[PDB]
Amino acid sequence: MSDYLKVLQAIKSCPKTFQSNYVRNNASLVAEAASRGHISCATTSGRNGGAWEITASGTRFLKRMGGCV
Numbered sequence: 001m002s003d004y005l006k007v008l009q010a011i012k013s014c015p016k017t018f019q020s021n022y023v024r025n026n027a028s029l030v031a032e033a034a035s036r037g038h039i040s041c042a043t044t045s046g047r048n049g050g051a052w053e054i055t056a057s058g059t060r061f062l063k064r065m066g067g068c069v
Contacts, residue, residue, distance in 0.1 A: 002065075002066045002067065002068060002069055003029065004030070004032045004033070007019060007023075007026065008030060008033055008053070009062060009067065011054070012054055019051065019052065019053060021051065024050070024051060027052075033052075033058065036061070038054070038062070039058070040054065
């Protein structure tokens, strides 16, 4: 989960990182977030608009759990 933690949250702090198009390929990482308790879905159809996004809350708890390290 260490790698996953930063995947969604990284983009809100530093754009493009792991959420923009990365979600479509590494959806399993983003799916872990359901266990952490916070996620948001844009369309999940393609990889451009159909991606997931993090909520403001997710960045605080999830990243501190050892995000990337």
